[PDB]
């Protein structure tokens, strides 16, 4: 049958208006304009209607060389993207167009990106811990298989490195299809990641692959960043529903999805919120989040990163995003300045699975104490920085000497940051983390110095570091002795 055709009305940045004479399509319908006029293909989804015979819309690719009276073709459907095993080991754009230059993807069906969330009947919150190998993540804020995870932190705190370390520990040790959505981040990171995966045969092209990559990065206009995570979720939901298989959804990061809608709502004429974000922040974020839910058919263990401008948690976007998460990971910058990486602030962090019913009892009674001690150490930082260590009771400076040990022990080297720290990466098991913190908590190791806990994993490595420190101290004593005798 005929495809409806319309004409442009006005253009403001990525935003466009369209006049469909006979009638208007529904919301979210796609509008293609030929590559003849603009020079390249261009899809434009409708978001709202101004009056009848009219429709305002957002453009995916650039609006350059676009005129006021161009023809606009209606697809008769939403933005459709392919799904299946052909999407494995391939890179895709927001529209499902591939960019890896490998070959034509052998899709069979195409699903839309905009979709209503699952119903309450389908949901199933099952509590199963997720052994990352990371120490603080295991202890304080244990992740939950099938839930959501959040890595909150400013620029230059170590969350993209947390994601690479989680890939190296969990993804390859998963046996389930993964999806990686780059939403307004460095193109360089996506290149390093496609190479790190093409080296480990996870994207083995001539055989079986177990990963998918979507990348609408900062170079793209906000029309793409505002609709990329939807496409990645479509690739994940196909595996969740049809295949009924556990998957992962690594997202880096949703704050640029929020910036995209913020840069859009201004142009659409919507009056903005307090700081300047869109008024539809909670809804636009919820329709993204609530699609990530663990049903009976499958399960989605998402790992989302979030940006915090000016290291400001009162920003409405992260402040809204805390509510949607099962396990928060609040990073800080003052901690990274102290040499610790990962720069976690466990007093701010939280989780849902942290109950005796889900995790074992020792892990819980240990973490509850660990949080408590650091809570006291924070109260004493206001005084020690004023007076000093010597002006405290023996109980207080003990608790300080123990909490400095704990906080230093919370650090560890990752295999990804070997370039930075120059140390081999450790994989701290869950059981040895709790046995170490419980021993450190009951004073089982108090004679050990402070620095032996820095950037290490496992108490055996601590006591070998203490042995090296004592050996070097004695060696400098013999050396100062001989230097004095010869002098």
């Amino acid at each position: 049958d005929v495809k409806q055709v319309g004409y442009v009305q006005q253009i403001i940045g990525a935003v466009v208006d369209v006049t469909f004479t006979d009638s208007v399509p529904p919301v979210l319908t796609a509008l293609t304009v030929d590559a003849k006029e603009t020079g390249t293909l261009l899809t434009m989804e409708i978001v709202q209607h101004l009056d009848t015979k009219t429709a305002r819309c957002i453009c995916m690719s650039s609006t350059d060389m676009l005129r006021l009276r161009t023809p606009v073709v209606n697809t008769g459907s939403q933005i459709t993207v392919p799904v299946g095993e052909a999407t494995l080991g391939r890179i895709f754009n927001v529209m499902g167009d591939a960019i890896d230059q490998r070959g034509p993807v052998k899709n069979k069906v195409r699903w839309p990106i905009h979709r209503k969330a699952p119903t309450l009947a389908e949901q199933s919150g099952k509590d199963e811990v997720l052994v990352t190998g990371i120490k603080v993540i295991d202890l304080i804020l244990p992740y939950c298989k099938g839930g959501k995870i959040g890595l909150f932190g400013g620029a230059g705190v170590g969350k993209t490195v947390i994601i690479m370390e989680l890939i190296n520990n969990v993804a390859k040790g998963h046996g389930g299809y993964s999806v990686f959505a780059g939403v307004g981040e460095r193109t360089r990171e996506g290149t390093d990641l496609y190479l790190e995966m093409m080296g480990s045969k996870v994207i083995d092209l001539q055989g079986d692959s177990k990963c998918v990559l979507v990348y609408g990065q900062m170079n793209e206009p906000p029309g793409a960043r505002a609709r990329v995570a939807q496409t990645a979720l479509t690739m994940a939901e196909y595996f969740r529903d049809e295949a009924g298989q556990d998957v992962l959804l690594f997202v880096d990061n949703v704050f640029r999805f929020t910036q995209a809608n913020s840069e859009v709502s201004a142009l659409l004429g919507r009056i903005p919120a307090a700081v300047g974000y869109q008024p539809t922040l909670a809804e636009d974020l919820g329709m993204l989040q609530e699609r990530i839910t663990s049903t009976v058919k499958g399960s989605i263990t998402s790992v989302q990163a979030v940006y915090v401008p000016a290291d400001d948690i009162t920003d409405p976007a992260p402040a809204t995003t805390f509510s949607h998460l099962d396990a928060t990971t609040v990073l800080s910058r003052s901690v990274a300045e102290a040499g610790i990486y990962p720069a976690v602030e466990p007093l701010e962090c939280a989780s849902r699975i942290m109950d005796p019913d889900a995790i074992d009892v020792n892990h819980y009674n240990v973490a509850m104490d660990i949080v408590e001690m650091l809570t006291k150490y924070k109260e004493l930082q206001d005084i020690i920085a004023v007076l000093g260590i010597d002006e405290l009771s023996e109980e207080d400076k003990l608790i300080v000497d123990r909490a400095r040990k704990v906080a230093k022990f919370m650090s560890q080297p990752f295999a990804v940051a070997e370039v930075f720290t120059g140390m081999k990466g450790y994989y701290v098991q869950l059981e040895d983390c709790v046995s170490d913190f419980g021993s450190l908590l009951m004073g089982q190791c108090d004679n050990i110095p402070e620095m032996a806990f820095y950037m290490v994993g496992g108490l055996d490595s601590v006591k070998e570091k203490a042995a090296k420190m004592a050996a070097e101290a004695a060696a400098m004593r013999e050396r100062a002795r001989k230097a004095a005798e010869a002098k």
């Binding site: 230059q101 190479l195 093409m198």
Partner: protein, 170 residues
């Protein structure tokens, strides 16, 4: 050439390189050869070891960097940056012929101290230098010893016992 080379991403490259070696040999200014490599990488034709070795031959036979001269042009650093490009950047490793061109250039340049380093660098990699070159190297070293030109003259000049911003030549 049944073997096939690939890129880090796994894309295929074309080893059809002969025409570029011909265009390198015709050049008479050794910077045009680097511009041929620039016209080679663009066409998905990364360099073969024959190509870099031809370039070193071209620098050795070429008279200058360009139709006009340039300040401080050295055939040596130009013949050693491309070797660093071979080893570290691209992964190809040079051969005896490659370093042999460098030792030839140091002989023609009259420098001798750098020559002995090219000798020890050659031998440390298992390369057999040609004694016809190292003999002329030692000959130029004996001459520069006889003429007192083993070092520059401005170093043997005694230093100012008194400290002065001008007397030190700063």
């Amino acid at each position: 050439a049944g073997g096939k080379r690939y890129d880090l991403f796994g894309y295929e490259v074309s080893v059809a390189t002969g025409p570029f070696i011909e265009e390198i040999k015709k050049a008479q200014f050794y910077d045009d050869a680097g511009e041929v490599i620039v016209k080679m990488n663009l066409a998905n034709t990364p360099p073969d070891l024959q190509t870099y070795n031809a370039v070193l031959e071209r620098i050795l036979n070429c008279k200058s960097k360009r139709s006009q001269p340039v300040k401080g042009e050295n055939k040596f650093a130009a013949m050693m940056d491309i070797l660093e490009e071979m080893d570290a950047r691209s992964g190809i490793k040079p051969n005896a012929e490659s370093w042999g061109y460098v030792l030839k250039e140091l002989v023609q340049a009259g420098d001798f101290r750098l020559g002995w380093v090219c000798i020890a660098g050659m031998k440390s990699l298992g390369i057999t230098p040609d004694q016809a070159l190292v003999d002329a190297n030692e000959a130029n070293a004996a001459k520069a010893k006889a003429a007192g030109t083993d070092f520059p003259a401005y170093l043997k000049k005694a230093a100012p016992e008194s400290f002065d911003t001008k007397a030190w030549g700063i």
